[PDB]
Structure formats: structure tokens, C-alpha cells
């Protein structure tokens, strides 16, 4: 068992139940994270929004530093602790098969660029802001599949796919020797809507004689159809490495698995003046 | 094995059918088999309507599973003359290409259309002989795959080498049959179908002639692409009505006003359409020259006099007619095209506007806004009535008597 | 019983239907539903459809979804949740129902499918998400392209090469493939040959359905999915029609969909107002000023320009096309050419038709080249075949064509438009594909020159046959008037000021006051008189139309104006037929004929010089000033 991974999951559960922002208009101790879970039950949502500034204000920012440095390693631990808080409050959001909940972080400090993408930042929470050029269609993805064998007839549930159609090598029934025959069960598999967005550099950054670089940004969760072509959006996610399936020397490709898209061009006509006045000092 | 005893009664039934069928005290099937020996043409044209009057059980078993009765027919013909090809001729209803559902699979169907193009000659293995690499064991394998095009799973029991010296091969040619445009509805594109020939059935038709082909509708793995194996290539009240109408001296005035009744006046223009649809006489000189019998009429004038309405009336009146435009038809539309198959890596020909409409009227719209590279192919088809294309090493001449 | 079937004791809905004790009770209730259900008049709606199915030799049984939910809810809730196991059991129910009335039906067809139509919930291609997976969703759109009828595989029977035995039958799925490892007679892993004698094939066709142009929001791109047609559903949807695909939203896994960086299996196709809205059309059209109310309602965001609103309103309804003894096809689409100086809201009229007409494709003259308007023969990057992609004139069948900047066009694109304005067909023969598609639509262009001393043949960069195909020639002249500038400036400011239940009702009341007839009622009024009401030309003044064209052609020769051919005479009947459609009448009276002549006269007199405008207005003032 991961000793460091269990400590982050235990601290993440208490952050969503003890943090509360005091309102300036009413003066009542209202919990923003507790009220956000109740709002996801009426609208039937599966994506939460957690601000990074609230994580740094607790325990002297000890929890926000472990997530911003190693985000891919603590990714299954953050999703496991979130399901425990939802089950305690509103357990009706689990039955659809269990629903897949994703965490979308917003309002990030440092906003990196495309030229600053290096190999040392692989597996850390970054923020890349660019212009959207080309977008793909809305297609599902095989997340947690279920393989059923033909000999032992065992339903192997909770089968993760690391960007490849992976199959189980052994059947849980000890009275079987099947290492190839496997059938995919669509009625017991968890599907997620993924979309690849090819972003480019910003229009305001026009340097000297250089080549325009592109980055394949993969969106998951409720981030589908959120980055329209022609609008500069602020992406947020982790830098993943997607290999070449057609070649299966292994060639790799630098990707960016984002989880939240913030449109800069987008942000009641009277509310447009109170936002710009409050965002400044 | 019950199939061994049933196969003996089928072969014996076909042997006695030829030695007993007679018409007007004359043996047609017996005289056709004896005359083919001196000519040395292993073929026999057996009509499908003659098997109905002889035995109803024979015609029923042939139309049900022809993949097993046809190979048994070739063995009975050779026993009488002592491999002969069986040619089946049907004179029943013509089934269109659009009415070929899943109920006609492995059944004798009759088609009628114009051949699009013709591929080259291909060799088909029938009696293969393999030889081992260690003990050098020579064994002969008889390929009885009648419903097959290519080598679908070659039987190889593989240290065996197929001997190309002591092996028999037969001829095989691929064809492309298109449905009749008279039955194709408006707003739709006529489909095609790939056929296969064997033995004397290769190099017999001309890409641009309407013939009747009776074959078996089947499928093969390449979702599967269908195919039809070619087996044989082929009132009194209505005649009296046409003879009495020709005797009327006012026939030249009746057919003139009947063609395109929307356009008023212009008796000299409507009179040329009757002479254009009839045409002259295709005379063939004994020296080797051919005279042009088709009439070409060019229209010109100010727009607004129903120019496009007159061209659409001729297409609906003439049996064989293909409507085309000016800029919408390039070199691959007006003439024949040379396309490459991405599956077999072979260059196959394709019919165009002046190729599929052989023997009819080709209505072209906007002849003044045409290009210069497409004007050379039209001038060659208006004098010699032929299309000579020598591209990609393919020198084929197609008749264009439009 | 029906009470024990509601208590779902399984973990999922697909597991409860597959139970033997549940499937036997479901098929039992479905058998009595097709024999005991009666309509409001005391007649069995499903009893008559069974007898008519065997007489026509069909395998499609239409079952209304609204008639099933009003009786038993157990058979209606499980159909929208798991339509896979529900359609398989109900298919055998319809087969047993036809055997009772016609026992000799098993020799023709072996399986009878069910055509489910009329769905309560309607969804589009953009609202397709992960929650609609494995559910019958009714999606409506326009068919763009389609494939051929390829025989699919269902019951494949393989043959062994080591013994000669037949292995099968095996159900072939459209997602995975059958891979036989061991045999049942020789136990070997040799190659198996597919027998072409004992395999039951089926029809298969892939049709790409796109969203309708009247439902796509402005500023976005339309979406398209893939529709699979099986059994007798093929050869039904044609490229250029509006159908309602009522299939199941499934998904397929592809090997190239994961390394480079949603198929809907149809079940029933139906080609395309209520009873309360039909009675309201006769009450409004009964007034004597119904024609003036429609002209004032056309483009409410533009003040003035009453002569241009009469041409756009007549082009939306169109004429009545009819064949002449199977020889000629007279067109009925009114072609309007918007000409004049830019700045008079010329491009704003084209955007109004795209949001009101049932099928309007907006195009331009700069971006749209040769293939941007007509069809094309492109190569597919997947199947490596020469496909056929539609253009602006191909995807706008029986609709309105909107082309911007008609003067800035190439010579190769002007000839293709003239060829489609007379025969209403675009013949394209490229890459050996000789196809003659149809193109019947009202082309409403808007070019830019306007010198009043010069005629229309010199101001507009066009030819003579191009200008002759247009029925109405609208000419706008930017004049100087202090009275018109005050009324136009007030309407602009009034339209920019006004740009939770009490706030929404106040916004709808301000929009209806500025249009005075609402916009939602005008959209359904045009489509109602275009597919049901067809006015005729019975009892009309044939001598009056001959005298108008005789005086119009005699004045254009002595003055040297635009020559009037025979195409201008047929444009009067097209405008007169459109006026009768606005009044919901089946006959064109003398009032509609006098209004169609004034439109052609005003479009021809104003399209000349200054000296010709002051001369033709005095001689042709008798036909315009009606009694």
C-alpha cells in the first residue's frame, strides 16, 4: 500500500468538510464545498470545481504543494476520497454501475506557455493558455471496461485502460487456463466522453521569425464542447505522454490531459461591471 | 453416405435426357453435341425451358442449388461423347439488378444490361499437383470450387511445392454489367456488378453492347461483395399497329407536334428531331470502311426559347439516352476513364457518357463554354464514331455510334 | 401478473428482461395488446394493420408509441431503457400474430420487424451525450450522402478443410468478429471457408445525417453522425430530404480512433403544426388586407423599402411546378436579384430568410468556387473510393438559395448557375461518375455595381443570359431626403434601447409591438401553403396578359432598354400564384393578377435610365392603377 498516497487522500476528505468562506454580505459561515455537492444532486452533475487558492490557505499550503508537484500519482487517490464525501452526504449520486467523478481545478497561480513545456514538468499540475484552432467531435472513451471470458465465464470488472485496449491475462477462477479469449461487456463498462483539441499560440504574442507550435489537448469529464475555435481559452490539466499505437524503439508524443477550460473572451448586463471591479486590487 | 447414391441418379438422369429429347422428329441436343466434335468446341447450349417439359423434379433441383447440379452436368456430357462447358439459356422474366435481395443467394437469376468494360485474361487452377520437399511425394488435388473467384483457402496439407508444369489451367475473365437506364428511377445513380467468365465465355462480349446474361447470385469474402458467375451469354397485335401507322401519309406531321408539346411553333426544329431519332443506315463496306449513319444536329440561338426543355424531351423519348452538360463533364465523363483498383492494383476501364449510350442520342448542354482538351475527344467520335485511348499502356478502341 | 413485473429485482434493466420467467410474461402481454386495443371509434387499429401486411408482402409493422403508453406502462418504460432485448422479444410476438390470421406467411418471410415511430422526446445531433447510450432516440435531420446496398452477414456457417463438415450457425455482430479456434469434429486450428450456400444475408447501408439548416444556431458548425439501415430500411432516405431517424444511439470502438488523437442503428424512418394552429390560418387569411400584413411583417428590423419586401415574400412561397405531358418541367421558384448601392441593409435580408425558411443554405461568391455551389467527386480518406459531396445548390432542394456578392464571381461559377436556373438539374460527369442531380430552389443573390444614367447591362458586371433568368430585378437608389432620414434614425435608436417571470413577459411584449403578426406564426404560414394548397390558373384574363407584354416589348425596342423575352412572361404567373398562396386560395382571381404585373413593371422601369423611367411611368400607369 502507498503510504504517501493514503495521507493525501485522508487530508483531501477533511478539506471538503472543514473549509468554509465567510460571506461579506450576510456574515454567516457558509461552506462552499459542502453546498457544491448538494447542488450537483439536482442538476445531476459529475464534475466539481475546487479553487487552488483555498488549498494553499490550509496547513500552510502543505497539501497544495503535493498536488501541484505530483498530480498524476495522486490522481486515483483524489478521486477515491471524493467518492467517500459524496456517499456520506447524498448517496443517490452513485447509482446510474457507479458514476465516475472528476475534479476540475480552476483559478491557478502560474500560467505557463507552450514554449515552456519541458520533460521535467511531466506529471505536474500546469496551466497553458492559448488559442483554439481545430477541434474534433464528441466521441466516447473506454475507461473502466469489463472483460468476460468464455471458459471460466468470469466477469472481470474494474479494468483500467492506459490509452490502449488492454486485456486481462488471467481469469479469477483458478480452474481455468485462458490467456487470450476475452469478450468485452458493454453493459458493465464505464464510458467517458473525451475530445482532442489542437490549440496554438496566442494572437497577441507575435515575436520574430519563428514557427507556430501546436499542442494536442485532451479534454475529459464535463469539459467537452467548451473550447470553441477562435477564442483564447485558459486550459488546466496535466502533461501526459501518449505513445504510438500504430507502431505496436517506441516513439512518444507530448500531450496535455486537461480537466477544466476557462474562456478568457467570455468573462445580466449589470453583473459585467461588478466582476471587473472585484478582480482588481 | 446417402449423398453417394443420390449423385448416381442425377448423372444417369442427364445422360438419358439428351438421348431422348426430340422436337418435331428432330434431335437438337444430339445433333449439337455431334457437330461440336469436328469443330472442336467443348460447349453445349442447353435451354432452361426444355428441362421443364421433361421432368419437373430436374428443373426444381437445378434452380435450388445450382452449385452442385452444374458440376454433375459436365460429367454426363463427357460420358456421352466418349471437360465440356454447360451453357444455360433462360427465356423467362428478366429480374432487374435493383430487385436482388438476400432471397436470390445461390440461385439461378437472369439479368440484362450493357457491359461496362472488360479486364484481361486470368488463369484459374483446376488440377493442381504438389510435391514434398523431403520425401518428394507427388499428389494431385482436384479443385472443385465452382463458386469461387480467387484462391480462397488453398488446400495445402506446408513443405509442399505446387508444380506449374503438370497442372491444368482454365481461362477466366472479369466483367462489369450495368443495369438498363430505362428502369433506373430519377434522382438515382445506376449501380454495377462484377461478373466472372470461364472457358469459352471469355473474350465474347464487347464493352458497349446490351446482352442477356444468366448466372448465379452469390457472395464471397473480400460485409461481403456480391458477384455472379456467368453461365451462358445470349406480339402480333403490336406489329400490326406499327404497320398501319406507317401507311398514314400524315405521320410526319403527327410525330412532329407530339415531340415536346410545350414549345409552340418552330416546325423546322421539331421536324429535325424525328429524323435524328430514326437515323440513317449503317452501311459496312467490304474493303473495311464504315460509313457514318448517325445524324448530328447543333442548336444555337438566344436563350429563353426552351433550349434545356427540348433536350430533356429527347432523353425521355429515346430508349438509350444520357443527358450531360458542358463544364460538368471532363475527360473521364464524356469519354472512357482509366481507374486503378486500390484492392487488386489493376487498371480497369470505366464507361463514360458517349460509351454507355452506344446507339442512342447524347444530349449535351452548354456546348460553347466547354474546354479545349475536351473538344479533341468529341471531334474524333463525330467522324470515325470510335474512341481511341492509349494511356497507361492500354490501347483499346471503343465504338461510339451516338 | 402485471403487478409483479414492475418490481425490478435485478441489478440492471437488461438482466430483468433476459430472465425466462419475465420474458414469457412480457411476450404474453404484447400478444393481447395487438388484438384487444381499439381506437376512439370502436375499431382495432392494430387489427387492420396485420391483414394489410400480408396482402402487400412486407416485413415492416408500424406500431405507434403513444398508443402503447396509454394502456400498459411496463412495456413502454422498458423499451426506452433497453431497446435491444425488448425489440428481440417483440419481433416474435408480431410473427405469431400474423400466423393466426395467415398461416401461410412463414413461407415468404421468416422474421417480421417493428417500426416504432412518433416519439414523445425529440433530440438533435448536438444534444447526443453519454446518457442516451443504448436508448431509442428520435433524431431529425437532412440526409446529405449515402452508400450502396451491401449484403451484410448475419448467420455465417464456416466449413472445415480437414473433414469437410459444416460448422454453424453463428450470429454475426456488427461490432466484433467471429473467430473459431477449435472444431467439433477434428479439433484443429486450420482455416475455415465461408460457405456461400447456407448463409442468411441482409441489407446494409451507411447514411450520414446532418443537422437541419433551420435549427443550427448562428455562429456555430453543424454536426453529423452515421446511420445504419438494415432489413428493408435501405433505399428509403435520399440525399436531399428531411427524415426522422428513430433509432438507437449506440457506439463502436475503432483502432484508428485512439491513435490519431457514435453510430446510430436506425429502426424506423419517416420522411417529412397542430389542429389549433390550422384553424387560426383561415381566420387571418380571411381579411382583405392579408397581403399587406405579410409584406409589413417581412424583415421587421428594416424600415421602409416596401418594394423589396414584396419580392422576398413572393420568393418564399414560390409557384406550382407541373410537368407538360412528361416532356418539359416548368419551374416555379421566383428568382430575385438584389441590386443597388450597398448600405441599404442588402445583406440583412439574406440573413432573415435563413432564420425563417425551412431550408436555406447561405453561400457567398468569394469563398464558394466551382464545387462550393454544385456537387463534387472527392476521394474518401478511409474507404479510398470516389465519393460524391454535395454543395450549396445540391443540399438546398425545394428550398431557398442565398448567395452573397454575385458580382465578384469567377467565369467558371457563373455558367453552372445559369445551367441550373432553366432545367433545374446539375449534370456532373467527373472521375467516371456520370450523375444528373436535381436542384430546384429560389436563388436570391445580392450583387454590387449605381449610375442612374447607365443601364443595368453596364452597371452590373454580368451577362445577358444571367440577368434574363431572374424574375424580379430589385434596384435600390440611395437618394437624399430629409424626411426619410428622420424616420430611419428613430427606428435605429428604438431598436437598440430594448436590445424572473415578469422580466421575460416584458421582453416578449416589446418585441411583438415593434413587429406590428408574430414571427413564430409567419414561419408556419409559409410551409402550410407550400405542401397542401396548390392554386390553379382557372378563369383568368388571358387577353389582359397578352396586352401587357405587347406594350412592354414595344417600348423597350424604340427606347433601347432591356429586351423582354418569353422568360419574363412566365414570371408574371409565378408571382400571381404566390399571391394566392398568401390568402389560402386554390384559384387565382383578378386581384392577384393585377398585383403581379405591378411587381414586374416596377422592377423593369426602375432598372433603366432617368429618361426611360419618366417615360414608361406615364404609359404603363393604366395597368398599375387598378380600378
Amino acid at each position: 500500500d502507498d503510504v504517501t498516497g493514503e495521507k493525501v487522500r485522508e487530508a483531501f476528505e477533511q478539506f471538503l468538510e472543514d473549509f468554509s468562506v465567510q460571506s461579506t454580505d450576510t456574515g454567516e459561515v457558509e461552506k462552499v464545498y459542502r453546498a457544491q455537492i448538494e447542488f450537483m444532486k439536482i442538476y445531476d452533475l459529475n464534475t466539481i470545481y475546487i479553487d487552488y487558492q483555498h488549498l494553499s490557505m490550509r496547513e500552510n499550503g502543505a497539501l497544495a504543494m503535493a498536488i501541484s508537484e505530483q498530480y498524476y500519482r495522486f490522481l486515483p487517490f483524489l478521486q477515491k476520497g471524493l467518492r467517500r464525501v459524496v456517499r456520506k452526504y447524498a448517496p443517490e449520486l452513485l447509482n446510474t454501475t457507479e458514476r465516475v467523478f472528476q475534479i476540475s481545478f480552476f483559478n491557478l497561480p502560474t500560467v505557463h506557455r507552450i514554449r515552456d513545456i519541458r520533460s521535467e514538468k511531466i506529471g505536474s499540475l500546469l496551466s497553458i493558455s492559448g488559442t483554439v484552432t481545430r477541434t474534433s467531435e464528441v466521441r466516447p472513451e473506454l475507461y473502466k471496461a469489463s472483460f468476460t471470458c468464455d471458459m471460466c465465464r468470469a466477469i472481470v470488472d474494474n479494468v483500467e485502460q492506459s490509452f490502449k485496449y488492454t486485456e486481462p491475462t488471467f481469469c479469477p477462477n483458478p480452474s481455468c487456463e485462458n490467456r487470450a479469449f476475452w469478450t468485452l461487456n458493454v453493459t458493465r463498462s464505464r464510458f467517458l466522453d473525451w475530445q482532442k483539441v489542437r490549440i496554438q499560440e496566442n494572437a497577441n504574442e507575435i515575436p520574430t521569425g519563428s514557427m507556430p507550435r501546436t499542442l494536442d489537448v485532451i479534454l475529459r469529464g464535463d469539459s467537452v464542447e467548451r473550447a470553441k475555435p477562435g477564442d483564447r481559452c485558459k486550459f488546466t490539466g496535466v502533461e501526459i505522454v501518449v505513445p504510438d499505437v500504430t507502431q505496436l524503439d517506441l516513439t512518444y508524443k507530448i500531450s496535455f490531459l486537461a480537466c477544466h477550460v476557462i474562456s478568457i473572451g467570455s468573462n445580466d448586463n449589470e453583473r459585467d461591471q461588478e466582476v471587473f471591479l472585484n478582480s482588481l486590487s | 453416405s446417402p449423398n453417394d447414391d443420390d449423385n448416381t441418379e442425377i448423372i444417369k438422369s442427364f445422360k438419358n435426357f439428351i438421348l431422348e429429347f426430340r422436337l418435331d422428329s428432330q434431335f437438337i441436343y444430339r445433333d449439337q453435341l455431334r457437330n461440336n466434335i469436328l469443330v472442336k468446341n467443348y460447349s453445349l447450349t442447353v435451354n432452361m425451358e426444355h428441362l421443364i417439359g421433361y421432368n419437373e423434379d430436374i428443373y426444381k433441383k437445378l434452380s435450388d442449388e445450382p452449385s452442385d447440379i452444374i458440376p454433375l452436368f459436365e460429367t454426363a456430357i463427357t460420358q456421352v461423347a466418349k471437360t465440356f462447358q454447360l451453357i444455360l439459356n433462360s427465356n423467362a422474366n428478366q429480374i432487374p439488378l435493383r430487385d436482388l435481395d438476400s432471397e436470390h443467394v445461390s440461385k439461378i437469376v437472369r439479368l440484362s444490361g450493357i457491359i461496362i468494360s472488360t479486364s484481361v485474361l486470368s488463369s484459374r487452377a483446376t488440377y493442381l499437383s504438389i510435391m514434398c520437399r523431403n520425401c518428394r511425394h507427388t499428389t494431385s488435388i482436384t479443385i472443385n470450387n465452382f463458386n469461387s473467384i480467387t484462391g480462397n483457402t488453398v488446400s495445402l496439407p506446408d513443405p509442399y511445392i505446387i508444380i506449374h508444369e503438370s497442372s491444368k489451367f482454365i481461362d477466366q475473365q472479369f466483367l462489369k454489367l450495368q443495369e438498363i437506364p430505362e428502369l433506373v428511377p430519377v434522382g438515382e445513380m445506376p449501380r454495377n456488378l462484377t461478373m466472372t467468365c470461364d472457358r469459352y465465355l471469355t473474350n465474347k462480349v464487347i464493352p458497349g453492347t446490351r446482352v442477356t446474361i444468366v448466372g448465379i447470385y452469390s457472395i464471397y469474402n473480400s460485409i461481403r461483395t456480391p458477384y455472379i458467375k456467368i453461365l451462358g451469354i445470349q406480339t402480333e397485335e403490336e406489329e400490326e399497329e406499327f404497320l398501319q401507322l406507317s401507311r398514314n401519309p400524315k405521320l410526319y406531321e403527327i410525330l412532329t407536334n407530339s415531340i415536346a408539346p410545350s414549345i409552340f411553333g418552330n416546325e423546322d426544329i421539331k421536324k429535325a428531331i424525328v429524323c435524328l431519332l430514326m437515323g440513317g443506315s449503317k452501311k459496312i463496306l467490304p474493303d473495311g470502311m464504315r460509313l457514318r449513319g448517325d445524324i448530328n444536329v447543333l442548336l444555337l440561338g438566344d436563350p429563353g426559347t426552351a433550349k434545356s426543355q427540348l433536350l430533356k424531351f429527347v432523353e425521355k423519348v429515346s430508349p438509350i439516352a444520357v443527358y450531360t452538360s458542358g463544364k460538368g463533364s471532363s475527360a473521364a465523363g464524356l469519354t472512357a476513364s482509366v481507374q486503378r483498383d486500390p484492392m487488386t492494383r489493376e487498371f480497369y476501364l470505366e464507361g463514360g457518357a458517349m460509351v454507355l449510350a452506344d446507339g442512342g442520342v447524347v444530349c449535351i448542354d452548354e456546348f460553347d463554354k466547354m474546354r479545349d482538351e475536351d473538344r479533341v475527344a468529341i471531334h474524333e467520335a463525330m467522324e470515325q464514331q470510335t474512341i481511341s485511348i492509349a494511356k497507361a499502356g492500354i490501347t483499346t478502341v471503343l465504338n461510339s455510334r451516338t | 401478473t402485471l403487478e409483479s413485473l414492475s418490481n425490478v429485482k435485478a441489478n440492471s434493466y437488461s438482466e430483468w428482461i433476459t430472465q425466462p420467467n419475465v420474458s414469457r410474461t412480457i411476450a404474453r402481454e404484447l400478444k393481447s395488446f395487438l388484438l384487444e386495443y381499439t381506437d376512439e371509434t370502436g375499431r382495432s387499429v392494430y387489427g387492420a394493420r396485420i391483414r394489410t401486411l400480408g396482402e402487400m408482402n412486407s416485413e415492416s409493422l408500424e406500431v405507434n408509441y403513444r398508443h402503447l403508453a396509454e394502456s400498459k406502462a411496463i412495456l413502454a418504460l422498458f423499451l426506452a431503457k433497453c431497446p435491444e432485448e425488448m425489440l428481440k422479444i417483440f419481433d416474435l410476438v408480431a410473427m405469431e400474430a400474423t400466423e393466426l390470421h395467415y398461416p401461410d406467411y412463414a413461407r415468404i418471410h421468416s422474421e417480421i420487424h417493428v417500426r416504432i415511430s412518433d416519439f414523445p422526446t425529440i433530440y438533435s445531433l448536438r444534444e447526443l451525450r453519454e446518457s442516451n447510450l443504448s436508448s431509442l432516440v428520435r433524431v431529425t435531420g437532412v440526409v446529405t450522402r449515402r452508400t450502396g446496398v451491401f449484403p451484410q452477414l448475419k448467420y455465417v456457417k464456416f466449413n472445415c478443410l480437414k473433414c469437410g463438415s459444416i460448422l454453424g450457425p453463428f450470429f454475426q455482430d456488427s461490432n466484433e468478429e467471429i473467430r473459431i479456434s477449435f472444431c467439433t469434429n477434428c479439433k484443429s486450428k486450420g482455416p475455415f471457408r465461408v460457405n456461400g450456400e447456407k448463409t442468411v444475408y441482409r441489407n446494409y447501408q451507411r447514411v450520414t445525417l446532418q443537422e437541419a439548416p433551420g435549427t443550427v444556431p448562428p455562429g456555430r458548425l453543424p454536426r453529423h453522425r452515421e446511420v445504419i439501415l438494415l432489413a428493408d430500411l435501405v433505399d428509403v432516405s435520399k440525399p436531399g430530404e428531411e427524415v426522422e431517424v428513430t433509432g438507437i444511439y449506440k457506439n463502436n470502438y475503432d483502432g484508428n480512433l485512439n491513435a490519431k488523437n457514435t453510430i446510430i442503428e436506425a429502426n424506423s424512418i419517416k420522411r417529412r403544426w397542430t389542429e389549433e394552429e390550422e384553424r387560426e390560418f383561415r381566420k387571418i387569411s380571411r381579411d382583405r388586407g392579408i397581403i399587406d400584413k405579410i409584406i409589413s411583417s417581412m424583415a421587421p428590423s428594416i424600415y421602409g423599402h416596401r418594394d423589396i419586401k414584396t419580392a422576398v415574400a413572393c420568393s418564399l412561397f414560390g409557384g406550382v411546378p407541373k410537368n407538360v405531358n412528361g416532356k418539359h418541367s416548368i419551374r416555379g421558384d421566383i428568382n430575385v436579384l438584389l441590386l443597388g448601392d450597398p448600405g441599404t441593409a442588402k445583406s440583412q435580408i439574406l440573413k432573415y430568410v435563413e432564420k425563417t425558411a425551412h431550408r436555406a443554405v447561405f453561400a457567398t461568391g468569394q469563398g464558394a468556387s466551382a464545387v462550393g455551389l454544385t456537387a463534387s467527386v472527392r476521394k474518401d480518406p478511409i474507404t479510398k473510393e470516389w465519393t460524391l459531396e454535395g454543395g450549396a445548390l445540391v443540399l438546398a432542394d425545394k428550398g431557398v438559395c442565398l448567395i452573397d456578392e454575385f458580382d465578384k464571381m469567377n467565369d467558371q461559377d457563373r455558367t453552372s448557375i445559369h445551367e441550373a436556373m432553366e432545367q433545374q438539374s446539375i449534370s456532373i460527369s467527373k472521375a467516371g461518375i456520370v450523375t444528373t442531380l436535381q436542384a430546384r430552389c429560389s436563388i436570391i443573390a445580392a450583387a454590387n455595381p449605381y449610375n442612374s444614367t447607365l443601364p443595368l447591362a453596364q452597371n452590373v458586371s454580368l451577362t445577358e443570359p444571367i440577368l434574363s433568368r431572374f424574375d424580379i430585378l430589385c434596384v435600390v437608389r440611395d437618394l437624399v431626403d430629409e424626411e426619410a432620414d428622420e424616420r430611419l434614425a428613430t427606428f435605429v435608436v428604438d431598436s437598440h434601447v430594448r436590445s424572473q417571470l415578469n422580466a421575460r413577459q416584458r421582453r416578449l411584449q416589446r418585441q411583438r409591438k415593434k413587429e406590428e403578426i408574430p414571427q413564430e406564426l409567419l414561419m408556419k404560414y409559409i410551409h402550410y401553403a407550400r405542401t397542401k394548397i396548390y392554386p390553379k390558373l382557372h378563369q383568368m384574363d388571358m387577353d389582359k396578359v397578352s396586352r401587357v407584354y405587347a406594350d412592354l416589348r414595344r417600348e423597350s425596342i424604340s427606347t433601347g432598354s432591356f429586351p423582354i423575352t418569353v422568360r419574363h412572361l412566365e414570371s408574371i404567373l409565378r408571382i400571381a400564384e404566390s399571391f394566392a398562396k398568401m390568402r389560402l386560395s386554390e384559384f387565382v382571381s383578378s386581384y392577384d393578377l393585377d398585383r403581379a404585373i405591378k411587381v414586374v413593371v416596377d422592377s423593369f422601369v426602375d432598372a433603366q435610365k432617368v429618361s426611360v423611367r419618366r417615360q414608361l411611368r406615364r404609359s404603363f400607369a393604366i395597368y398599375t392603377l387598378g380600378h
Binding site: - | - | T41, A48, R49, K72
Partner: protein
């Protein structure tokens, strides 16, 4: 959708043919008869329109539709003649058609000793249909014969309108009370809008005192057929209450309300919408609404007060 055509001269052999056609197409189509040239001359006495009410003359129901009903002659204190001389001549000519139609449809059922009593008092009255320069109306009598061309439609079970046109033919229509006589073996069919606004109709009427099988003992034909004919104001209280008694116009929308609501979520219950409780709620809704009509006997289904927000 089959429209058979058979001559009536051969029937006076074709008895079981019409008996098997009233179940599918129901509406029969005749053709030639004894009246040919005199049928077109009846329009001379059609442009009258000069009679008041008292169940006679035109009925100005408001607006462009009217029904010129002409009462019979033997009925006392219910006569109002005018200038319809051609209408009275066809009253006796078409009277034989009503008796001959029973010999080819009612004769095959049981016997013929019952159809002679319904067509004996001659109490039927014609109804002339006119339009000035259409709601789904149900037939009043049991038999309805009317010469026309189109007009009729279908409200062949594809819920679609069928506009047929047969020149020189007679279109027959079946009533509503005739279905209950044949334990449900008939189907009604209304009309539709058409440019031809000149059609003559004729509906027969059973006698006032006649039994209606066994289920029509307490309710005769005079009490049942007079309900749909008086809803077009004496009595005025009984005419308004009969129009509001049609509970199907408000109870049919409830059977589909919860069906379209539970489908989007798949109510006080949390476990969706079971079929055992959904069918019980429909029977309880028709039972609760039945007590509202029983305790009120002019209610036009009033609305309830919506829950307003506080402050």
C-alpha cells in the same frame, strides 16, 4: 384501403359480400340508381334559406356552416314547407333505398322480421348541407347515404386522411347507434375541408318507440340520438351541461403527463415510476374526477390556485 364496386341490380348472390365489407372499410360506395338526371336538378330548390328554427330549415351556428334540415310530413305540429319541391320528390324515391339496404345487410343477420319495423313510420328527416361564400361531427342516425365526390376523409388504420374521388357514385356512411346493435362492428368517419361546398346529405332515423336489443331497454333511440343533435338552446341548461360532460378532453392529457415526465428522469415516490402504481393512478384519476361531476349535479373545469412566493 380497398374500395370495392358492385352493382345493386344483381343483388335484387351479393348478400354476404356487403356483410364482410362493413367491418373493414365500413363506408360503402354505390353508383347508379333509379335517379340520374333528376339528381342534378335538385339544386334549384337548394338556394332557399328562409325558415326559422323549430328543428327545420337552416341552422345558423356561429359561422359559414349551416344545416338545412327539413322535417317530415306525418309529424304533427312540426311542419314548415317552403320552395323545395325537388326535395319532397326525392323523399319518396330514396325511401326505397333505405329499405333495400336492409335486405343486403340486416337480412343476413338473424332474419328480416326486424328491419321492417324500423323503416315503417317514415319519421326520418333529410338534412341539407350548405356552406357560405369543420369540426369532427358524429353521425346522428343509424344509416347515412349522401351523393358527393370527396369531402369525407379518415380521422387503412394509419390515422391519415384519405380523400377519394369517384365520379357518378354514391358514398354511404354508418351511424353511431348501429355499432352497438352489431356488438361493435362499425367505424365512423368525419369530413374535411374541400373547395366543393355543395353536397346533399340524408340520414335515416329510427322510430321513437322501438327496443334497442337488450342493452337499450332503459335508453331508447330517441333519448340517445338526441344528445349529440342538441349540442349545436331548449333546454339551455341541458345543452351546456352536455358539452361540459365530455371528460375525455381533459382526462386524456393526464394519462400521458407522467409518461413523458418519468422518461426524462430514468412525484412523492423516489423509486422512479412503477407500472403497478401507474395503472392504479390512472384508475384513481378517473374515479376522483367522477365524484366531481356527481357532486355538482355549470362547471367548465376550473383551475387551481398556484403556490405564490412569499413577501
Amino acid at each position: 384501403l380497398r374500395v370495392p364496386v358492385i352493382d345493386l341490380n344483381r343483388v335484387s348472390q351479393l348478400l354476404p359480400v356487403v356483410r364482410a365489407i362493413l367491418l373493414q372499410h365500413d363506408t360503402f360506395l354505390l353508383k347508379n340508381y333509379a335517379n340520374k338526371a333528376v339528381l342534378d336538378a335538385l339544386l334549384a330548390g337548394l338556394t332557399t334559406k328562409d325558415l326559422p328554427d323549430t328543428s327545420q330549415g337552416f341552422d345558423a351556428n356561429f359561422v359559414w356552416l349551416e344545416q338545412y334540415i327539413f322535417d317530415t310530413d306525418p309529424q304533427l305540429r312540426f311542419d314548415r314547407k317552403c320552395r323545395n319541391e325537388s326535395l319532397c320528390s326525392i323523399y319518396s324515391r330514396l325511401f326505397k333505398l333505405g329499405l333495400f339496404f336492409a335486405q343486403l345487410c340486416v337480412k343476413s343477420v338473424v332474419s328480416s322480421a326486424e328491419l321492417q319495423d324500423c323503416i315503417s313510420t317514415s319519421h326520418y328527416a333529410t338534412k341539407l348541407t350548405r356552406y357560405f361564400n369543420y369540426v369532427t361531427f358524429l353521425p346522428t342516425g343509424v344509416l347515412t347515404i349522401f351523393p358527393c365526390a370527396k369531402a369525407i376523409r379518415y380521422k387503412t388504420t394509419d390515422n391519415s386522411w384519405v380523400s377519394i374521388d369517384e365520379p357518378d357514385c354514391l358514398l354511404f356512411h354508418t351511424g353511431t347507434l348501429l355499432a352497438r346493435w352489431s356488438q361493435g362492428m362499425h367505424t365512423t368517419s368525419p369530413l374535411q375541408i374541400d373547395p366543393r361546398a355543395n353536397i346533399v346529405s340524408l340520414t335515416i332515423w329510427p322510430p321513437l318507440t322501438t327496443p334497442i336489443s337488450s342493452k337499450g331497454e332503459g335508453t331508447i333511440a330517441n333519448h340517445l340520438l338526441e344528445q349529440q343533435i342538441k349540442a349545436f338552446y331548449y333546454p339551455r341548461e341541458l345543452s351546456i351541461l352536455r358539452l361540459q360532460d365530455a371528460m375525455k378532453f381533459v382526462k386524456e392529457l393526464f394519462t400521458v403527463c407522467e409518461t413523458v415526465l418519468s422518461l426524462n428522469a430514468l412525484l412523492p415516490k423516489r423509486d422512479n415510476l412503477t407500472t403497478l402504481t401507474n395503472k392504479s393512478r390512472t384508475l384513481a384519476f378517473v374515479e376522483r374526477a367522477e365524484s366531481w361531476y356527481q357532486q355538482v349535479i355549470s362547471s367548465n373545469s376550473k383551475t387551481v390556485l398556484s403556490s405564490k412566493v412569499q413577501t
